[model samples]
Target: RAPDSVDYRKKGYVTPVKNQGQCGSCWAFSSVGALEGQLKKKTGKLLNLSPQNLVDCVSENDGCGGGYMTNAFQYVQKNRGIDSEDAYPYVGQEESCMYNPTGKAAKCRGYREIPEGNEKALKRAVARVGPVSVAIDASLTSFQFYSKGVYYDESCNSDNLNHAVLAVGYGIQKGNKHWIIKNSWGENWGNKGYILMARNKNNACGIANLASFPKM
Candidate 1:
């Protein structure tokens, strides 16, 4: 039976919060986070994988301009693997794909996407799997200064997802259900580099609409 609350952080399956800097590489970070969680769950070793590797190599997505987590997964699958952050350090800028085949860190067979608009399915996946890569509309000013609390802005469009994040767990707080999401903005952001987003509300912020994670 699934518990009423689950936190990958407490379970020691989540890596430390990272910074994406002034770049639209949120997709890359989200993808890396999901993969990191999965790798940790399977091998019990948390790897600080490279988001910069995806930003430079994954051509399907526009490097610093923006991209999709799904695309990043495909790149990892087809390329055999990705390197660690120490091997391919982040510069937060557009540059040629410098991924080294010799320093490969982790490899996944492919990825799977949660059913669109299905929050329950996403929740099940989080409980059974590790973390999930999801997209959301983060254009609201409230999101920019999100320091704490369950974030909910009516103006945030569900169909216009502009940011990618990793759903690490789910729980209820103060009678409000929320999804525990890890952001790549920095450790100084919401809840020490995480956010509790409104959950169990049909596809809030388009989160459930574009949820996915890599498979080993």
Candidate 2:
């Protein structure tokens, strides 16, 4: 069982995942990935959370422009319930919403903030509760990458990693503090599907928002 209070700094690690392509649905991908982590923690079974569920079902526009993960989470709560990956497989690029979910619709019962992307607060959410919605410095290179290196060094000074990804787990590597992340890209990109980000690195993508699931 996950503890209600633990040093989040000690609990982050890279999540095994796939990528989302040219589709601008990074919001959907990252939001669902965070929810999936919570589900896994609650159910003890990892779920292949569906990005398509958000792309097609949410009130927001499909994979063209970006949206906030909090918005996507609320979309899932009130409109369509999140589906397992097998139930709603990803169709690469972007596609129209196809299926209506059968499970209970989800919504944001509450929200929390890290105040100007506080890394410690965000990591606490991941360690004590569940995954978090975070902004990254997704520059052109951020969108175009292939590696397993724990990302650090703000000298990149780029914000193009504009898309959102989940801050899942954390650990230390080669004298560097790192975060376990899940991306919106497909399986071929970035270390099988996820990247190990530097923890004390890069403003935690300016993480600032969170949408807690509504109570049953």
Q: Which is the leading candidate under TM-score?
A: 1
Per-residue lDDT of model 2, residues 56-150, tens digit only: 66766545566677667666666646676677887765566765556432334434555554566656656676666677765646535748677
Compared to the true structure, candidate 2 yields what TM-score?
0.75
Runs of candidate 1 with Cα error greater than 4 angstroms are none
lDDT (0 to 1) per candidate:
0.91, 0.60
TM-score of each: 0.97, 0.75
Q: Candidate 1 at 201: error in angstroms?
A: 2.2
Q: Per-residue lDDT tens digits of candidate 1, residues 113-214? A: 999989888898999998899999988889889887788887879999899999999999999889999999899888899999999876778889999999
